[PDB]
Amino acid sequence: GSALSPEEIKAKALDLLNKKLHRANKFGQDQADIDSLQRQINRVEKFGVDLNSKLAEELGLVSRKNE
């Protein structure tokens, strides 16, 4: 065990981002925010989630920003 397998993190990220992207578009959220989600999602499909990306922060894998 220990940690999450890339397949799970990638799918988990894609699922979370997909839901946001789908939810964002469904209500007409900020177009820029939706496209940003798309760029990150597509990046996950090709390379996956980055330990140092906004996605990883949203996923709760690492710290976003602290003083």
Q: How is this structure best described in words?
A:
The protein is mostly helical. The protein has one domain. 66% of the residues lie in helices and 0% in strands. The protein contains 3 helices and no strands. Helix 1 runs antiparallel to helix 2. The longest helix is centred in the N-terminal third of the chain and has 22 residues. The protein is globular and about 40 Å long. It starts with 5 loop residues before the first helix and ends in an 8-residue tail after the last helix. It is classed as rna binding protein. Keywords: RNA binding protein, THO1.
Which percent bin holds the helix content?
55-70%
Q: What does the main sheet amount to?
A: none
Structural class assignment: mainly alpha
Number of strands: 0
Shape category = globular
Strand content: under 5%
Number of domains: 1
Task: Return the string of H and E elements.
Answer: HHH
Estimated radius of gyration: 12 Å
Distance between the termini: 33 Å
Number of helices: 3
List the SSEs and their pairings.
Blueprint: H1 6-27, H2 31-46, H3 54-59
Helix pairs in contact: 1-2
Defining key terms:
monomeric, globular, monomer, 67 residues, Protein THO1, 3 helices, THO1, mainly alpha, protein THO1, rna binding protein
At a glance:
This protein is an all-alpha fold and 67 residues long. Helices cover 66% and strands 0% of the residues.
